[PDB]
Structure formats: structure tokens, C-alpha cells
Amino acid sequence: ATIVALKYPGGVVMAGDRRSTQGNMISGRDVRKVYITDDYTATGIAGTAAVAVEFARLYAVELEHYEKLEGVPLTFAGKINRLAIMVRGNLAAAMQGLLALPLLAGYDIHASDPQSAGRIVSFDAAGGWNIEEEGYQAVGSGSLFAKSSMKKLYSQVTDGDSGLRVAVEALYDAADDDSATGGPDLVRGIFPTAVIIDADGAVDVPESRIAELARAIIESRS
Amino acid sequence: ATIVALKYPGGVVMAGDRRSTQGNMISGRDVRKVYITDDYTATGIAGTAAVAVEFARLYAVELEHYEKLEGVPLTFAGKINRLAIMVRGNLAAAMQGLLALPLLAGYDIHASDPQSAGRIVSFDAAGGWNIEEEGYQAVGSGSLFAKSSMKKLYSQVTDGDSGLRVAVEALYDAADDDSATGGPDLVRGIFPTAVIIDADGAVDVPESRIAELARAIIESRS
Amino acid sequence: ATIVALKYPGGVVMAGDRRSTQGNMISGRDVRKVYITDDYTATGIAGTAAVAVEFARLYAVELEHYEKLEGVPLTFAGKINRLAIMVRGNLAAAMQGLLALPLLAGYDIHASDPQSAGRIVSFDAAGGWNIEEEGYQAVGSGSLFAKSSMKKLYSQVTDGDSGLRVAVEALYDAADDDSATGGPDLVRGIFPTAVIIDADGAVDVPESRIAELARAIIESRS
Amino acid sequence: ATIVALKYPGGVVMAGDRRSTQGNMISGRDVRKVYITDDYTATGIAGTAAVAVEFARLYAVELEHYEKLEGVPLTFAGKINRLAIMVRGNLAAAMQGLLALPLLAGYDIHASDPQSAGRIVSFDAAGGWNIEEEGYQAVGSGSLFAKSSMKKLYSQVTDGDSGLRVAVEALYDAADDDSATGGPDLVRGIFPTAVIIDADGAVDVPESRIAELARAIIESRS
Amino acid sequence: ATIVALKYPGGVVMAGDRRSTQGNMISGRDVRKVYITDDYTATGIAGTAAVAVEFARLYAVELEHYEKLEGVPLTFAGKINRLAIMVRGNLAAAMQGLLALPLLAGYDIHASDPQSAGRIVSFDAAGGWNIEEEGYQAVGSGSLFAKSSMKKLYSQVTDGDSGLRVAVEALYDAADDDSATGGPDLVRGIFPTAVIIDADGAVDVPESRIAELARAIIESRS
Amino acid sequence: ATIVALKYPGGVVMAGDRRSTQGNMISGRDVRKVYITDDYTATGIAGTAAVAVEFARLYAVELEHYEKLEGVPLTFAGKINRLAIMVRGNLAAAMQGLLALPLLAGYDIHASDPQSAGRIVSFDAAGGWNIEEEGYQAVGSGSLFAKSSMKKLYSQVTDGDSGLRVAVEALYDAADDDSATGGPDLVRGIFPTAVIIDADGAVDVPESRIAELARAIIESRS
Amino acid sequence: ATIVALKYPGGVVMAGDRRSTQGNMISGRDVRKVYITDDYTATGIAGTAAVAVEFARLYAVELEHYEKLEGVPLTFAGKINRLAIMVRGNLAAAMQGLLALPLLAGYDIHASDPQSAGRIVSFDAAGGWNIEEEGYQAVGSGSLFAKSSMKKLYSQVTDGDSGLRVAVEALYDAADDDSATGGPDLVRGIFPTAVIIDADGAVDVPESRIAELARAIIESRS
Amino acid sequence: ATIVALKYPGGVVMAGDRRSTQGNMISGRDVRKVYITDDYTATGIAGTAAVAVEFARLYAVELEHYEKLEGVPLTFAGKINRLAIMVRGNLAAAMQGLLALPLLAGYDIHASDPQSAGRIVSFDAAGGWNIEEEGYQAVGSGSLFAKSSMKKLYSQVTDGDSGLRVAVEALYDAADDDSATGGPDLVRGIFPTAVIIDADGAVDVPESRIAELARAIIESRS
Amino acid sequence: ATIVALKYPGGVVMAGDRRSTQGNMISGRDVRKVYITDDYTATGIAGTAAVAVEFARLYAVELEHYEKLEGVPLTFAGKINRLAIMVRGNLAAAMQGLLALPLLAGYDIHASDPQSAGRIVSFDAAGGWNIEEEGYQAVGSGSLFAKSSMKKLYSQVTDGDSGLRVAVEALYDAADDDSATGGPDLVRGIFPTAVIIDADGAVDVPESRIAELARAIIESRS
């Protein structure tokens, strides 16, 4: 399982693969791991479908509950703090074999420069968080291969389409190197899922755009 | 890793996949695991390239050494006994984490009915061996999926081409269900390797025949 | 023990075997493991008779209690959530040697397309749940053999009778491969139990229909 | 796995089942566990095919080697002593997880009363042996059920046919109670193997006689 | 510590870093890990200076001893076999905390096509060996980062200079990602060591060529 | 990770490096570990960014809460006592693998001699604290190398600029000897962060002053 | 215990302290740890008097035995190899709690440039050896403090007297920082022992020269 | 660390050394371990500065709190009882590696004979206390050497100056024999701290008196 | 048990106590632990009577055997080497609970200055030996008290009588402080045993001289 996130001028993009495994046995082929949590943020957890959907459900409930009580949404720092509290309150269970490390992507609407308002936040096992400054991040078992691919491909990113293409290619490289990550499935027609957040909000990327991009990458590598 | 073997009227066929893994990391894409050991037998070990090639090398040396000393080749039972001795003399090392379970396919030229002269022999960890009577066998981490596929497809086998096709389809099903087994790679052009043994001896199957069969299976499943 | 479930156009079918074991000793020959829990759902737990009947009893009590308090039945998602809470609240006892993994089959009456309203939900040890998209699922110790049989036989399913026949044949294959699963007993006259859920609700399949289907399968394999 | 032996007036009969298991998974359906070792003795080991065939092979080689060196066959007591030495020289490996407990049946030609010349000898883990005096014995995982069945059915034994029938019925009861023992397979046509030793020597029982006896037992129990 | 090797048209190149560590403490800044072992082969071990120099010394003594006894040098396969024997005879000590995994680069003069005569051989802990077919390989603690860098940069290799440049850049990326690997030291003037093997034999690359290449890479990344 | 602090006539200076590691893998290149906690104190924790920022956040909240409740700020001894209570209340978690040892620097405005009003306080694992009397202190994994460098360079400190230069040189020596400490990065332009506290309060040192000082040190050592 | 060695133009100098400890208890005040082993080499082991004297005795016997058998002394590389064999043949006893790590200093008379003929060789626990290139080295429990002191003081070394002074000052700093190392004892009149090796051979430094140098250092630090 | 106490005619004297250690590494050179707790008592704990200062702070707070509540100071027996309660309430933490054993010195103003009113009380790990009758006591890691020195020197004590001199000489002997105890530092000018309690109360001994006494002892031993 | 040895002008003296213990139970009151081993040496082992007498017996046999074979006695260094070999060849048994640490006293007749020809050699557990330079040494469980007493009393030694008196007083102090050492027994009349070695050889001290010295010490301490 691998989720990637990268920043482009005017927004941020996040994408993940679709495989779930029980040892060496493939247990799922259509897992969704990236969820929109509010109008300007999205979360991705590298794990089973249930853990991702449940963590995203609880985080979205907390954010909307605050918005309804107080009349205004939380600031980006407040959202990071609430997520960090939820992650920290699970360390004993994580060391008991149930560890969920999330990745957060968002757009800050109160920033002075809108072209650099995209944000990426990662978390560690102890519950610590870091705002990333290089422009990309990856979590999961193929995260090192994906990060090494983005390190070489990031110079080509100039807007949303280039960023989406680079994210799909990084996921393809992670699948090429690690067997717990699933590649594009042309026989069944299953492709990675992506979310784009910009000044207008977080939207889901349609499946045909991802399919055309993945097919072009495959013909390029042939 | 998976090796399959099945019997058809007039001979036997054996085929294996090409993947080697170190945990969840893909370490090889072109591993050969099926080797011709003499004029009428072939062996397949589910493991790394070095173990398969070294075990096959030692077994072939033993068989040719006997043939040169005595002037005649061993009988099929003598070959089984020598292989069983070699397998038995490795049990402590196998329980130490280095276990190699071979699969043997051969053609008995001293049988009275030439159409049923194909043989398949499997081995267990303790060193025990069994001559198979159902018509097919599989070893490795995807052996259960391959055996369940051959159980349903074996009624279509009537000659060498049908047997080769059923063997390739069983390997495809094993790859579809288990991530340590590699499927046909159309981008790189890597396909499983096969050997056919009949009354004229053991020959390697050319790569283009396997490639056409695998492509037909893929278009059928699409 | 094995329970299978598959989707056909217009409904869903679920069936299980009748054997209970204490090690290698047969302890029961007439165990019922599939229970109707409300008018449109059925549950199956792979285990002893008492665990299946008690879990089904508690789940049915919870569903009817909500229906009586609120005046309306829960939605399908609410039923999944309540079942997931019950499964999650048993993880320590499951790791203490008492693990019960249920399988849920249902018909959603609020779906827009009635021909695809059948649902199948599976659970994992940690309490996670997945809605299945391939059309079939199996749990228990013979679940892999049954799933490999349904993978090859699912193209023949066009309505309720074909689905029932394919489910019985998958259970027969699981019994043929795994000794903890019991096959059809012709001497004693004991056959697997099945439930069919469609737009009119969940009904038990009569024993003579299952008996005729099993006898036809046995004569086909002879 | 179960082997039974019983004494009738004028000889002895020994029979075993055909199943081999790896945990709960059926690994063999045609295992032969009873072998003729010389002209008047037969041995049965409850285990895999390889262990039974190899132990019988070594014991037969030892007996024939003595007969060729000395010009005369060993006495029955000498055969028991040699078998006991072979069994004793395996205790550490047996406690290491590889335990083979044999059962010996024979006809003593130097006895004064030919109608009571049949012998049955059993062995324990430590290597101790006992000549049986009740008329029947069983080894394996279903040995208790088979012995309890022979205790009630032994009054019907008056000659070779009755003894064969009672042995087949005892094996059927063992299969009915224990899942590691295989019953008669009517779909595949596989039946237990038997050996009869009398004043003329040890002969294999043809498969059709066993098949007719098993079918009569099955119709009786229906 | 990291050693890289890659194949170019007409030869092969191998290079390694200069750092040795004792935990988090830097213990050496001028370690040489790549040694010429005969006229057409070179070896690299990822470890301390003493282990690399001693293993290379023993392997070179063995190769020259054979050449002096027999009058001819060994074939490439014979050299691989001797190295594999030496590696295999150290497994217990390797699991005792002293593991040395070598990487072999060579030029085969008896190949029919001189432009593809370069060879790269890697070894695993158990002693197994593989001839590489992709064109590059890396060992050590930064081997994954170096391999991911060569995967993207290998399309630029057309001759010896390009291959040397790509090898230096891959070592730079490994140092950038892993702290046990040392980067180019401009204050002290210490650079990686390289060896080039072609049809004329194995030669050491002068330090000023490596220094100019590393300086150009550093100004490119600035 | 290393933080250094030293006293000069009229104030105190504190500086730390920017590296975070996960074993031998570099995980961060821009970590800030020194934070201004009130108008006259600064704290530095050798660890991840999250631990440093969170500990500093809690300590600053406590100090400002007291100042708002009571109308006056705490004395220097009261601040030391509150910090010691916070450090002591974490010993079990520290022995559980999460140990945070802070270093405190401050300026006492109620001292009679303003030229010696700078203070440095260190803490141990058990929670004990010491006011330092030699003029410098260091914490972290390169603290011994930095302390040995300051022991030789402290005679050159006469004012704020000399103290800043000596602190940067001590951090450079720590990075030169220990691989978990990061040196000045000229390719990326990342330099250590420093804080100066004097009679006017604690201010952050601009990045260009540190950059010029580090460049002069590098050219001196070349 | 600490031994230091440094290279000056025209030779090498080695010196060690005089303390032996049993835990926190001082057990010796006059231990000699540096011994002349032949006309151009000296060895120092950080440990008890008996271990140092016995190791030096055995090494000197080996060197003189070779010189008497062969008629010529060994080369410097041969001496290093013999010492490395002796060190390697003690690893199990070293891990059993008796570890002796030697330091070797010598003058190579067959070098082309006599002003750089001094050599310093260190050894690790596994038996590996390194020729040092920086100009100084230290072993023992205060070796890090001594090395950090020599790093700052080495620019003052221009001949034998300066090198001796820097070695004494480095030992003084090691004693100042670590309690297992003894400083100059002015009450008892005990000072460190030193050896100087140049083109004329290895000689012991008289005690009054060391005493005057140590007294000057003490008055400088006062 | 060592604290000594001895009784002279008309009062009592207590003194301790200034060293703190972390294993074999010197961590402090100016530790104060003897504190005045009320007008007629003083306490000394052999340990770090923080433990001594914190224990003394808590004990002084308790004594003054009683004096303020009740209007009169506690008797000497009441002070011993309160100290014993505090020591006893720390046994589990002491066996967890944090053991603090105090030594108490005081002057009893309600005794009938003022020349023998000095008191010395020691404590054990279990919390037990003893009033000493020999005239001297010592705690710490050099307590045995100090006690053996006082046993021979106690005949010279006739008043406050002789007692102070004997206490300083006993501390010097403890430092001479044990490396965790620090001796007089003439280079840095650091000397042991002492307290004298007589009929007028407890006062701190000035540093120059201790310095002159220590210098006279050093010249005597030279 | 305690043995003391001290050097006086013209010779050496050695003395030990007479107690043996089994835990807290007194098991012997007349143990002799100091034995003359040749004309100029004596040995003392702190332990049971049998160990001391047997070790002394073996060492004396070895010394006399050499003297008889070679015609001359060994040098003092040769005697030390032989004793060290015997002590070293017992380390495993010593760590098994049977540890014997000897103390050697002797007179060197080949020394140039006869007034300083006395020698004292001690041994450690690992087998290491040291020639002592301070003038006295002690081994056993009361060795620290005896050494601290000799440190204060050694200034009074001017000849054999003073040395004997100081040795008896040191043994008395050891008995006064440690309960495993026995003091002079006036009721039974048992006193310590002593040996004096001078230029004329080693002689046993008569019991009445020791008795008068011990009585004078006792009346002095009263």
C-alpha cells in the first residue's frame, strides 16, 4: 500500500493504490484509501479499507462538529492539532500490531500567497507531525521507491495535470518495486484514486483521466 | 513461486514462473526454475535461481556419473531413490530456514503402455516421496490455486498443446491469487518457461509459443 | 466448516456445511450455521452450533429492538455498523482462542436498481468490514477451495436455481479438499442448508431441492 | 490412518485405509500401508506412503539377507526380535516428531496346532512388543473406534470371509468416527487394501471382493 | 557503505564510497572497498577496510594459484563457482554478526559479442549467486536509493564516460539519503574510487577525473 | 542532534543543528529545535521537531498562565522548578523509549551584576537539574565533541559575535565527528538556528549572519 | 586507560597513562602499557600491566624468531599481518570479557621519503586493522577526549619535542575528562611513559623530560 | 561521593566532596552535598546535586512548618522520626535504581552535658536509623577508606580545628583510594565544603580555611 | 581470611589468620594458610586449609623438580612465570565457584642492592600478576581494612621486629572490621602464623613471639 502527495502551483494532489494483502495472499483489489474530509482537506491511511474509512469518518465528524458548535471552521493549525491528538491516542494499540499512519493534504485559504497555499503533513508512530517543505511525500510499504521516483520527476511539475501525471508514475514505480502495492490492472480496469485540492475545494478525479494517464505511461515504458 | 506438472496422452509437461522475492520486495524477474536433468527427466525447485540450478547440477552429475561407471542408465525407481536420498540429507538445514522441495517429471521408456509412460513425483519436507495418480501436481506458494484451477481444466487435455495451454492458465491463476508468483509481463516480454518430455526426450518449449498462448489467455479473460 | 455466498440477478444465496470437529474427531453431523436475522438479511458464522445461534440471536434482538423503539428499520449501512461494533468488541477473546468471523448477506430495498440490490459483507479479525464486488465470498477452513471453484463456475449463474446449484457444488469441492468440512451424507440423508433472499424476503430452502441438486452433482462427478 | 488385524481359524487378516493428511488438508487418496514382507508375514505402519514402503523394504531386505546367508528362514521369535531392534533404534527421532509404530501379522508354520497358528504383534513407542491374545488389534488415530467395533463383532468370525467382512466393517466405523481415516470412496472407486495369510502363504485380496463387501455394508447401514 | 556497478557498451564500471561507521560515529574517511582481483575482474565488499582487503587478497591468491598450477586461467563460470564456495563457507559467522556480501564485475573474453561481454554477479546471505540482466546493481545500506537513481539515469549511458558519470551520481544520491554512506568531501578532497574493465583489462580511474565529475554534479544540483 | 549554549559578557547564546534521523536514514533536513519560551528564556530539546515544539509550547503556556494570574512573572528559580517538575513527570515514558532532555538558557534581570546575568541549566534523565559554572554546555549525540571543541575555543569569547562564532564552530565539529548531526548544507542553503538573549530580551539570529559565519569557518578549514 | 600516538616529521611518538582500576577502585598507580617490541616498532595495549607485558612479550618473541630463522627482519606489512593474526585469534575470549585492543607505532626504513616513514596502525574487536592517515590516534576509555584535543593541537607539531608536548597535553585532557585515566601525580612523582621512534630506532623517553613538560602544562592551565 | 561526620568536645562537624559521575565520566566538579536544614542540624546525601538539594529542601520545609504551626521546634527524636518516615517512603524507588541514603548531624540543646551534645545519625536502605556512639561516621562509595582513616586519626581531635583537619584528611584518603570521590583541585581552586554546629548554631566553614588545611595536608604527604 | 605481606630493610614478612567459615558458621580455628615453598619464597592463599596446602605442595614440587633436572634453581622471574601459568590454568573452575588467589613473597639473591631484595607479587582472577612497589599488600575478605591500617602504620617499619608488629596489628584491624577473619584467641591460645625471609632464607616465626606481640597490641588498645 502506498499513498503519494505532491504540491503544484495553485494546489495539491494526493493518490493511492488499490491493493490489500494478508501476508502473500491478495485479499482486495478495489480498496479506496484517500477520502475527502472537509471542503479543503483530504486524508490517506496506508492500510485496510475499514481502517481508512473509519479514521476518515471520525475525523470528518470532529471537524464538522466544531464548525457547527462555533459557527466557523478551524484554522489549518487547529486541524493538525486535532489529528495529532487522535493519532497519539493510539500508540499502545499500534505497538500491539494495529498501526495507522495518516497523511494529510490541504489548502490554506488564509495564506497571503495563494499559489503556495498547498500543505502536506506527515505523522510518525509516536504521534509527531511535520509540515513538509520539499514538495512531495509518500507513506506505506513502497514509499521509498515512490519518493526516489518523485525526486527525479518533480522538475516537470508546473500545474495540476503534470502533478497528477507525476503522482501516477510514482505509484507505478512503487508497484514495480514492491509486491504489496498493486499496479494498474488493465484486464479488470481498476486504477488508482486521486483527489485534487485547489482554491475552489477538494474534488475527486474521474477514473477515465487516470486511466488515460496510466495507459500513456505504460506505452512509454514498453 | 509456483511450478506445475501435468500428464497428457504420450508425455508430460512442466512449467514454472519467473519471480523471486525478499519479503515484499521483488528481487528477480527472470528466474529459471525448471531444468532438464537427463534425456527423459526434468526437475523443478520452488526457490531462488541459485538453489534450483545447484540442485539440478548435482542431480545431473550423479545420474551421468552412474551412467558412465555402469554402462547403462538407472531405472526410474533408481532415480527416484537417489533424489530421495539427496532430499532427505537436508532436513536439519531445511528446518534452519533453507528448505528446497523438488518436483520431478519424467518419461519411463521401459513401460509396456507408451501412452501412459509419463510420471510425476513429489517430495515432502521429511524426505518422503509419492508417485501421483490424478494427472497433475503443483509446488510453491501458489500451488493450491494452481491445483484448484487444474482440477476444473484437466478435462480439456487431449495432447501436448492442450496440456501446455492448461499449464500456462494454471500459472496465470496462481499469479492472480498470490503476490509471490509473477504473471506474464507484457511490458518487458517475460513469460514462464516450460519443458515437454515425450518418447523422443525432453525439450525446451520456445518462448514465442508460450507468448502466444499467454496472450490468448489474457484476451480471453478481458 | 465453510459458508459460501453469491449474488445472482435479483437476489443473493448463502449456504453452509453441517460438520463440527474437536481436533480430528467428528463431534457433530447436523450443525446449522446459517440463520435468518431479519426480513432481508442472513448471517453465517463458521464455528460451533452454539456460537452461530447465539451471535445470530443477539444480532436479531438488536435489530428488532431498534425497529420497535424508532418505528422504522435501520438502513443497510446501519446494520453493517452495528454488526461491526459487535465483532470489534470481541478481539481479545478471539486472540484468547475464541474467534468468530461472520459473513453477512442481504437485500437492499432502497437501491435504485432492484436487479443488483443483493449485498455480501465480510469481516476480518480486527473487526474491519468490506462490501464485496466480485459476486461471491466464502469463510471457514475450506474457503480457499470454495472460492477457487466459484471463480470457474460463476459464469453459469443467471438466476436463483443456477446460483443455488453453484453454491452446492462449491461446498462439495471444499469438502473434497478439506477434512473439517463435511460433504453430502447419503447414508444418513443430511445435506447443506441454504437461504435465498430476494425482493420478497429471506426464505429457507427446502431440504429436498438441495438433496436433488447434490445427487445430480454426485452422479455428474461419477 | 488405521490398520486392523484379526485372527480367524486357520489364519490371520490385516487391512488398512487409504488416506494421508497434512493437518486438516487431504494430501493423498490412494496410500497403501500394508505390505507383504515375506512368505508368511505382513507389516502395517500407520503413516505416510513413503514411511510404510521404506520400513517394509528394509525389513524385507533384512529377512531375505538372513535367509540367504544361513540357508534357513528365521523363526517367528527371531523375526520379532529383529523388528523390535529396528523399532527401538528410532526413539529419539520419534520424539523429534517422526514416530512410526508398526503392526505385524504372521503365520507360524512350526506350531503344533495349525488352526491357531496365526499371530499378531504390536509395538509401543519405547520399542516394547506384545503378542496379542484376544484375537484382534488396531493401530492409528481411529484405533479405539475400530477396537470397540471388533469387540462387538468378533463373535461372528468363523473363517476367512467372515474375518475379512468384520475387518472392513471395523475400518468403516473408524472412518465414521475419525476424520483422519478415509472411508470407502464410491465416486472414485477406492477401497481399503487387505492381506490374508494362511498355511499356503500371504496373498493380496483382490479389489472387487473388498468392493462388494463394502457395498453390502453400506446398503446394510442405509 | 554502497558499491554500484553498471554495464556500458564495451565494458563495465564499479565504484564505492569511502565511509566506515561504528554506530553513529564516523570511524573512517578514506576506506577503499573496490579491488582489482585479476586482469579482468574486480570485487567490492560493503564493509570495513580490513574485510574488503582480506577477502580480495584471498580470492586473488586462489585465482593466481590455479593459473600457475594449470597453465591457463579459469573461465568466468569457474571464478563464479570459487567465489560462491568462499561466500557459502561463512554463513554461521555471518549470522554471528560478521556478514560480508560481495559484488563481482568482470569482462568475459571468450564471449562471441565483445560489446556485451561485461558481467555483473551478486550474492545473497545463503551463498546464492545471480548473473544480472538489467545493466546495473548496488549493494550496501544505500543500495535501494542508488538503484532507484540508476533506474532513471540508465538511458543516458552510451560509453565509459557516461557510465562513470551515472555511477558517481548514483553514489551521490545514496549519500544524500542514507547517513552511513559518505558523500564527496570538498574540504578534505576525498572522492569515491572507481574501476573500469574493458577488452584491455581492469584499470583504476584517476582521482582527478572523479573529482571533476563530482564537482560538475554538485554545481548542477545547486 | 546537538544543541550548544555558552555564556559571554552581557548575555547567552544557544544554537542547534537541523537533522532528524530514523536509524541510518535521514528523515528531516530543516528541523528547528531551539524556541523562545518567554521574553528572557529559550529552550532546546535534542529530538524530533514535534517533541521540541510541543514541549516548548506547553512550557510557554505555563509561564504565561502564571504571569496572567499573578500579575508578575516568575523568578528564575521558579521557572527552573516548573521545568524540573515537567521533566520529572516523564521518567517512565522516557525509559519506555521516549526520552526528552531539555537545555535551558536565560537572562536573570534581578541579578546585581548585569554582565554575568546569563544562565545555563541542564537536566538529567531522573529529572535532576544543575546550574552550570564553566560557561558552556551541550546536549545530544554529538555533545561530547562539541564540549571538547568549546573547551579549546572558549578563550576567544569576548562578546556576542565571538560567542556566536564559537557556537557555530562547535556545531561544525560535532557534525564532523557524529553522523546523526547535520553540518552546514551549502547546496540547499540550510544553516543552524541560533538565539541570543541579553538585557533587551531574546531575539532570533538572522540566517545570513549564520551563513556568513559558517562559510568563513569552512574556508578556514579548507 | 589511554594510549596516544602521533606522527611528526621524521618519526612517531607513543605515550600512555599509569592507572589500573577494578570498577571504581584504584588498583595500580605505576602501570606501564607501552613496550618496545623491536628496533623500529612499539606496541600499546589499554588494559592491565600483565596483559600488556604478555602480549608484547609474545609479539617480540615471534618477530625475533622469524629474524633468526630467515636471516632478515620482516617487512612492515608482514609485522602487521602477524599482529592481526594474533589479535584475530582472541575474539571469543574478548566477547567473554577479556578484550585487548592494541595500537602499533613504527618506522618504515624501506620507504622512499624518510620524513614520512612513521606509521600508526589500529585494530578493531573483530581483528581488522587500518593504517591511519590523519597523523594521530588514541585507544582506551579516554580516547575520544584525547582525539578531540589532538585535533585542535596538531597544527603546532613540527618536530619531536612538539609532538611529545602535544601527546602529554592530550593525555592530560583525557585524564581531566575520564576518571579511569590517571593524571600526572605530583605528590608521588609518577608521570606518563613515552617512546620515540626515528631513523635511529626506538628509545624510551627519560622521566625528567616528561616531568618538566607536564609541570609546564599544569602551570599553563592554572 | 563521600560525606564524613565526627564529634568533638562541644559540637560536631560534617564535610563532603564535590564530584559527580556518570559511570567513568566526570559530570560535575562543584557539587554541594551538605546543607543546613535548621538552626542546629545539617544533612548530607551522597548523590547528585539535585537529589541532595531537593531532599534537604523538603526536610527543611517540614521542620519549619511544624515550628510555625505548634510554636515550638521539634525535639531531636521527633526530627529523627520525621526523617526516618521520609527515608522509608522511598524503598521501592530505591530498589528501582534511585537510592538516597542521608547522614544527619545535629546539636541537642536540651541535653544535660553540653560538651557531649553533638549527635550523628545514619540510615540504612530499609529505612532503619542508628545513633552512633564511636564519634565518627561516613557514607558513600569511599566511606570504608574514610572510616579506616578516622579510626587511626581520631585520637588527635580535641576541638573544632582538629576535627575539621581530621575530616579533611579523611576525605583526602577516600579520594586517594576511590575514583568516584574527587580530591582537592589546586588548578581550579575547588575544595570540600564543611559545616560546624555548636551551642551557637550551624555555620558554613569559609573556603579559605579549608584551602589552607588541604594545602598543609598535601605538603605533609609530599 | 586475610594474608598480609610487607617489606622491611633487609627482607620481607608474611602473615595470615586462622579462621575458616561455611557461611556464617565457624568451621575451623587452626587453619594454616602461609607455607614455605623453597629456601627463599613463601606463598599464601586465602581459603580453606586443603586448597592452601595443595597449591603450595604442587608449586614446591614444580620448583624442586626443575632444580633437580637442571642443576640450578630458577630465577625469580621464572618462578613468577610458573606460578602465573598455574593460576591461569584455573579460571573456568574459579568462575565455577572455586577461586584461589595467591600472594607470593620472596627474597632475590641476585639483586645488586641486598637491602631492597625483598619482593611481593600479587595475582588477579584472570591470572595477571603485578610486582608491588608501595611496600605492602593484602589479600582476602579483610584486605581493604588491613591495607588501610598498613597505610598509616608503615612509617614505623625500620627492621624485622617492627615489620612483624605492624603485620600483626594490620591483621588485628582486619579481624576487628570483618567477621570472616579471626582475631587472636586468648582463651584457646591460637595466634596468627608468620614467615620471615631474609638473606639467610625463609624461617617460621615461633608462636610465643607472635603471642607476646598480640598481647601488647591488645593491652595498648584497651
UniProtKB/Swiss-Prot annotation, chains A, B, C, D, E, F, G, H, I:
The gene is prcB. Its EC number is 3.4.25.1. This is Proteasome subunit beta. The unprocessed form of PrcB is phosphorylated by PknA. Processing of PrcB is greatly retarded in the presence of H(2)O(2). The 20S proteasome core is composed of 14 alpha and 14 beta subunits that assemble into four stacked heptameric rings, resulting in a barrel-shaped structure. The two inner rings, each composed of seven catalytic beta subunits, are sandwiched by two outer rings, each composed of seven alpha subunits. The catalytic chamber with the active sites is on the inside of the barrel. Has a gated structure, the ends of the cylinder being occluded by the N-termini of the alpha-subunits. Is capped by the proteasome-associated ATPase, ARC (Mpa). Disruption phenotype: Cells lacking the core proteasome prcBA subunits exhibit reduced growth and persistence in mice. They are also attenuated in interferon-gamma-deficient mice. They also display increased sensitivity to reactive nitrogen intermediates (RNI) and increased resistance to oxidative stress. Disulfide bonds: none annotated. The active site is at 1 (nucleophile). The record marks 1 as: Covalent link with the inhibitor MLN-273. It is an enzyme of class 3 (hydrolase). It catalyses: Cleavage of peptide bonds with very broad specificity. Its main location: cytoplasm. The formation of the proteasomal ATPase ARC-20S proteasome complex, likely via the docking of the C-termini of ARC into the intersubunit pockets in the alpha-rings, may trigger opening of the gate for substrate entry. Interconversion between the open-gate and close-gate conformations leads to a dynamic regulation of the 20S proteasome proteolysis activity. In vitro, chymotryptic and tryptic activities of the proteasome are both completely inhibited by epoxomicin and by the peptidyl boronate inhibitor MLN-273. Also inhibited by Mg(2+), Ca(2+) and SDS. The keyword Ubl conjugation does not apply.
